[PDB]
Ligand binder design. Structure first.
Ligand code: 6CI
Length: 262
């Protein structure tokens, strides 16, 4: 798609942000942008740009342009001024980022995931570190790793793939299998990260025993201050059987109701 194509000279790099990711300026609009460069495999990078062209949602990071004719290749996106959600929650004023703001953040993220669910994408690395925060608690999900997968289907990760174990669904840990329901599992963990203002999940629990614990129905306990209804949602996301987990449309509806009633 050539409406997306721009010359690399249209952008000036201002600050390196790691991970081959720069804060840049789109000079004709004096616009601050994020720029991902390639110093992963080329074809993988180009397909990631291709997927992002199809994505249009208020809570998914918006593609602005690509430079894909000649190396080095660029993917240019909107810039989210406050950076990743994990550090944002860890460093925030909790009187400002209070319970209703946490609900608002969860509603936004579930809205993005509902859109992906509907458009046959999976994310596969849903976590606070991969959400970005703009002004007035706007949250966007980073969408650079999206894979096409018809919502009824399963992706099998390449042999020897390494996971973020504590965000990873049981079926992914055991069988390298991913679906939108494994994104639902990860969303549950993300909810826990939000509720704890960015605590690390399963604290102190040895990574090699996480799977064994999950199969015996161990789950993280309700965070201090966490509303019971939100915790119930976490627990639904963490059902062992992927088909028992709620869809993102249901999750989003549930949060929309909670947020509106707050
Ligand atoms: C081409 O865009 C990307 C490619 C890779 C990536 O990981 C993210 C982005 C991305 C898009 N919009 C963004 N808006 C803002 C920031 C950003 C600003 N400041 C600090 C941080 C941060 O938390 N750390 C550096 C740890 C992130 C990143 C982005």
């Amino acid at each position: 798609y050539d409406k997306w194509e721009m010359e690399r000279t249209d952008i000036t790099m201002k600050h390196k942000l790691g991970g081959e990711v720069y804060e840049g300026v789109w000079k004709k609009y004096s616009l601050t942008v994020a720029v991902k460069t390639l110093k992963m495999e080329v074809e993988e990078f180009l397909k990631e740009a291709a997927v992002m062209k199809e994505i249009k949602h208020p809570n998914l990071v918006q593609l602005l342009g690509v430079c894909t004719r000649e190396p080095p290749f660029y993917i240019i996106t909107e810039f989210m001024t406050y950076g990743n959600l994990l550090d944002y929650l860890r460093e925030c004023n909790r009187q400002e980022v209070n319970a209703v703001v946490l609900l608002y953040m969860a509603t936004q993220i579930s809205s993005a995931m509902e859109y992906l669910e509907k458009k046959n994408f999976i994310h596969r690395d849903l976590a606070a570190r991969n959400c970005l925060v703009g002004e007035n608690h706007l949250v966007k999900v980073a969408d650079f790793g999206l894979s096409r997968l018809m919502t009824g289907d399963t992706y099998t990760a390449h042999a020897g793939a390494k996971f973020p174990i504590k965000w990873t669904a049981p079926e992914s840990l055991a069988y390298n299998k991913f679906s939108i329901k494994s994104d639902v599992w990860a969303f549950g963990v993300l909810l826990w990260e939000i509720a704890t203002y960015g605590m690390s999940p399963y604290p102190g629990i040895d990574l090699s025993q996480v799977y064994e614990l999950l199969e015996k129905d161990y789950r993280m306990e309700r965070p201090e201050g966490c509303p019971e209804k939100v915790y119930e949602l976490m627990r639904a996301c963490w059902q062992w059987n992927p088909s028992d987990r709620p869809s993102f449309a249901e999750i989003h509806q549930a949060f929309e109701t909670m947020f509106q009633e707050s």
